[PDB]
Amino acid sequence: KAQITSQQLRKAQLQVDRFAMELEQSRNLSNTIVHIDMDAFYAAVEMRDNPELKDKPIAVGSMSMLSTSNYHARRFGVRAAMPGFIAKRLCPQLIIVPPNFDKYRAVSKEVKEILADYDPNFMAMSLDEAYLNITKHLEERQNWPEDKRRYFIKMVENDNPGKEVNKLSEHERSISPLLFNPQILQNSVVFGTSAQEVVKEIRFRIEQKTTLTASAGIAPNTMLAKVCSDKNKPNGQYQILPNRQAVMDFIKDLPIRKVSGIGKVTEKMLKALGIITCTELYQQRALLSLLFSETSWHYFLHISLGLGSTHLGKSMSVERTFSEINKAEEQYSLCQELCSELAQDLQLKGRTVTIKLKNVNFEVKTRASVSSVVSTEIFAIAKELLKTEIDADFPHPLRLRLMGVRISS
């Protein structure tokens, strides 16, 4: 049999190491990519709508093929893309529930609405996973006050102290015993400015809206991020910091089987060459450029160098946070000096004027108007979207802490 010459293998090394150097010199660590993964999405959804499944092994699909296994079922080894009879052998009591994608699509949309807030250009890979580049969000959140990172936590008849606390003030204290709107708020929680905090805010909002949990990964790039979210799986999140050492430390011996991107077949061929960890993937880079497709070893090299996409261009918006405002007059003129704050012309003006509000308990509510169309303003649409809000629980006034306007078509 012929062999690769301990010479020609050398030429390769030079060519590979020339490409490796050109890659090392250009690695960006300045971006923060997030990968979101809804925990056993389809199944968790069914579990939600039918509480009878909450404490059991279930999977979405049919006997011919499973699609999504809840974590109870996964402990038995039940996996998606696994034939039903094999799952039933592993787990006899498994309850296989038929898919219903319309209910999955809807919940997913809800999730997407939340992911858009942090990156309007996020990439939705499927109904249960997405990539976000929060780089820009972070640069801004940096200067945000507590009230712009405060959300209504779900715990309405709660004993929370109101304005009667005024008796403890210096001027009412001693007098109370001498005598002859309660302003009661509902709980809300705050998240910090760091990347980990931002992702916790996201997961929190999702669980509060959907009842479902999600895992996530934070890293300098798309590839690392994907692997990351998988680490503290059910409802956990892990991050790799923007330093090469942390990147290479994570990549050290990382089993190839944990690197989504390398196909099952390619993994099989790699095993035959005795290659498992990403380190070995780097060690045998010369032999790999000679044996695998150009597309495959290029990928191999990037993986072994902990490199991936650092990027994945709808809105023009304003938004003010303030102390409680509940008088309509105040709410409108603010909407006017806000629609006017949209002087940011550069191309008063065009299509979908979405409104954003946050009440006194930090409950979020967004409402827009797919559309209006041209002829010979911002406000005129904001007024209406705002008016129908003052008229909602119409007898009770709208108690605000936040107001924002955003153009989008």
From Swiss-Prot:
It is found in: Nucleus. Coiled coil: none annotated. Transmembrane segments: none annotated. Residues 33-263 form the UmuC domain. Belongs to the DNA polymerase type-Y family. Mg(2+) binds at D37, D128, E129. DNA polymerase specifically involved in DNA repair. Plays an important role in translesion synthesis, where the normal high-fidelity DNA polymerases cannot proceed and DNA synthesis stalls. Depending on the context, it inserts the correct base, but causes frequent base transitions, transversions and frameshifts. Lacks 3'-5' proofreading exonuclease activity. Forms a Schiff base with 5'-deoxyribose phosphate at abasic sites, but does not have lyase activity. The chain holds residues 71 to 515 of 870 of the full protein. This is DNA polymerase kappa. It comes from Homo sapiens. Changing E129A: Loss of DNA polymerase activity. Changing D128A: Loss of DNA polymerase activity. Detected at low levels in testis, spleen, prostate and ovary. Detected at very low levels in kidney, colon, brain, heart, liver, lung, placenta, pancreas and peripheral blood leukocytes. The catalytic core consists of fingers, palm and thumb subdomains, but the fingers and thumb subdomains are much smaller than in high-fidelity polymerases; residues from five sequence motifs of the Y-family cluster around an active site cleft that can accommodate DNA and nucleotide substrates with relaxed geometric constraints, with consequently higher rates of misincorporation and low processivity. Interacts with REV1. Interacts with PCNA.
